[PDB]
Amino acid sequence: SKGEELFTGVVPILVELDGDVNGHKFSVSGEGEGDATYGKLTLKLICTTGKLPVPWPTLVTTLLQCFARYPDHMKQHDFFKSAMPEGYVQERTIFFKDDGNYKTRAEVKFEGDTLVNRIELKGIDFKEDGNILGHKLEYNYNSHNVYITADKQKNGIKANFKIRHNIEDGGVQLADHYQQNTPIGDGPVLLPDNHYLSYQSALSKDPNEKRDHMVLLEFVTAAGIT
Ligand SMILES: [Zn+2]
């Protein structure tokens, strides 16, 4: 099982994100582990530049779908593991309704025994007292299904999905996600049948940590084979 063998145990994870939203620069550094057997991802993400100038929930989708649990019946549809260890590029555009947009490029690959995600994020067209730069989003997260389809012509996959962020005063901030993933290698990859990834996301704090940070626990399971 090419790539899948790399994910049979607990894999250490490093995340490094360099961000600029409306000219406000920030870096995020993350450490944790992934246990694909259980679809389990645990990360502690730290803003190393001081105060994060956007809400932590707006970066959850950006901050390792190779840790999704594909049931045994669906192992032929797992593109993300098939691209390893050479890895893949994930690009997203995220449009916040009635606000700005994020454009992200991430390179997901192994460095020795460690799965690394090097991410660059650029945000433009935000309102200074909107929900994002105004910090008006709740520190919580809704379950959602991500529909995956083959992009046969780009030897990869695509996905589009809607995230609803809870606004403090009540109401929801829509974030429309458009995603493409392409392998880094010329190694063969699995191009899947349509399916979805079911996400459950839990956000918390390390009570001992004084820097601006997010503890992220997520469980991701492939489904949607009719
Ligand atoms: Zn088929």
Author numbering: 2 to 64, 68 to 230
Sentences from the paper on this structure:
Venus is a yellow fluorescent derivative of the classical Aequorea victoria GFP protein. In situ synthesis of the chromophore is critical and occurs through the stepwise covalent arrangement of three contiguous residues Xaa-Tyr-Gly (where Xaa can be various amino acid residues), with only molecular O2 needed. In the case of Venus, these three residues are 65-Gly-Tyr-Gly-67.
To incorporate a photochemical switch into Venus, we replaced the chromophore residue Tyr66 with the aromatic non-canonical amino acid p-azido-l-phenylalanine (azF);34,35 effectively the hydroxyl group of tyrosine is replaced with an azide group. The most significant differences occur in and around the chromophore (termed CRO). Electron density fits well to a cyclised chromophore containing the intact azide group present on the P ring. Further analysis of the chromophore, including comparative estimates of bond distances between the refined structure of im-Venus66azF with the refined Venus structure, reveals several novel features that provide us with insights into CRO maturation and the role of molecular O2 in the process. In im-Venus66azF, the backbone carbonyl of the strictly conserved Gly67 is twisted ∼180° out of position compared to that observed in other FPs (b and ESI Fig. 3d, e†). The O2 molecule lies between the twisted carbonyl oxygen of the Gly67 and the hydroxyl group of Tyr203 above the plane of I ring element. His148, a critical H-bonding residue to the mature CRO, exists fully in the open-gate conformation. A channel leads to the chromophore in im-Venus66azF that is only available if His148 occupies the “open” state; when His148 occupies the “closed” state normally observed in mature fluorescent proteins, the tunnel becomes blocked.
